[PDB]
């Protein structure tokens, strides 16, 4: 998970980084400067994680590419309402125990932490209204409210 400047005064231990909603991991930290768009960074991360899926289990293999396409739309400014909620539900449903191995929980840790700490950059990509259907002439749609 991503951490902010306030977490920089944290000892690099498993327990202390664990209580801050992250993982000590390999203890090889990576700094993100102000010039880096967080949506593009998480898109790069999720592209890596989706293409490195082994394909055994449904949530990782078929839900990481959905997050990749959502983040690609957000980076282009083609996000639609419900995209961020879909990302949050994907983070919830790819957690530990939902998938066969721990590749997908690790995949969704940066996405959920970046949405938690930098939500304003993700909402900046939502510009178009949600549209999943085209018009079929002769059939009146069921207009939800």
């Amino acid at each position: 998970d991503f951490l902010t400047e306030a977490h920089l005064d944290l000892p690099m231990e498993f327990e202390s980084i664990g209580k801050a909603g992250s993982r000590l991991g390999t203890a090889l930290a990576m700094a993100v400067d102000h010039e880096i768009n967080m949506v593009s960074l998480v898109r790069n991360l999720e592209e890596f994680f989706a293409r490195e899926s082994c394909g055994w289990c449904t949530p990782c293999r078929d839900g990481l590419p959905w997050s990749v396409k959502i983040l690609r739309a957000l980076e282009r400014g083609e996000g639609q309402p419900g995209d961020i909620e879909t990302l949050e539900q994907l983070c919830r449903f790819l957690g530990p125990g939902k998938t066969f191995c721990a590749h997908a929980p690790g995949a969704v840790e940066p996405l959920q932490s970046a949405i938690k700490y930098f939500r304003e950059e993700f909402e900046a990509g939502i510009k178009q209204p949600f549209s999943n259907t085209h018009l079929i002439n002769g059939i009146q749609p069921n207009l939800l409210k």
Partner: protein, 213 residues
């Protein structure tokens, strides 16, 4: 191109209808044909329906009787309550199994000439009621002259079947008197309406979308 029917209610045949039909040629001279045409014209322009209904199809038929349709214009509004004064039996409704002897009795009590229109899917075949208490079509025991599909056919569909019956009556051959001549009833084998209308029906390309009024 004619079918000849001869009735035999007291013969060696138990299954209804008590008749025999055979495909023959037209029996039709310069005066008998003209007077037969005059009788056919008079019969087809004065068709008195029997006030008889079984179900919802009867509601549509009597709707055709009212002012918004005015089946009186064709001369077919007289609507006799007695089978003796009626010329046309419209089986307008389901042929219920309990009602089938009644329908047979009422058809028997009608007098010559008589025509039968089976109105609606129930009378045609049993319709949607393939069920224990329903005869699967009134033509299992009543000879039917015109079939109207629909559930119900709209009043103008009943009027269209009335015009179809008029064209069938206008070229039929019936005994001019019961004392002298052939007494069997000759009905022309018409071209089917499906094959007649196939050319103009298949050529349809676009219809109005179902989104407006």
């Amino acid at each position: 191109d004619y079918t000849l029917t001869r009735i035999d209610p007291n013969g060696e045949n138990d299954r209804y209808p008590l008749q025999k039909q055979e495909i023959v040629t037209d029996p039709l001279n310069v005066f008998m044909g003209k007077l037969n045409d005059m009788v056919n014209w008079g019969r087809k322009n004065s068709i008195w329906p029997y006030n008889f209904g079984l179900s919802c199809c009867y509601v549509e038929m009597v709707t055709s009787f009212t002012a918004v349709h005015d089946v009186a214009r064709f001369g077919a509004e007289v609507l006799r309550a007695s089978p003796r004064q009626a010329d046309l039996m419209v089986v307008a409704g389901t042929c219920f199994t309990k009602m089938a002897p009644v329908i047979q009795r009422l058809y028997d009590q009608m007098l010559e000439p008589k025509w039968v229109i089976s109105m609606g899917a129930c009378a045609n075949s049993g319709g949607m009621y393939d069920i224990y208490s329903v005869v699967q079509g009134v033509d299992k025991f009543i000879p039917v002259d015109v079939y109207i599909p629909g559930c119900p056919p709209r009043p103008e569909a009943y009027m269209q079947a009335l015009m179809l019956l008029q064209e069938s009556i206008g070229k039929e051959r019936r005994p001019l008197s019961w004392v002298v001549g052939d007494q069997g009833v000759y009905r022309a084998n018409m071209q089917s309406e499906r094959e007649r209308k196939r050319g103009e029906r298949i050529a349809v390309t676009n219809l109005r979308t179902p989104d407006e009024i």
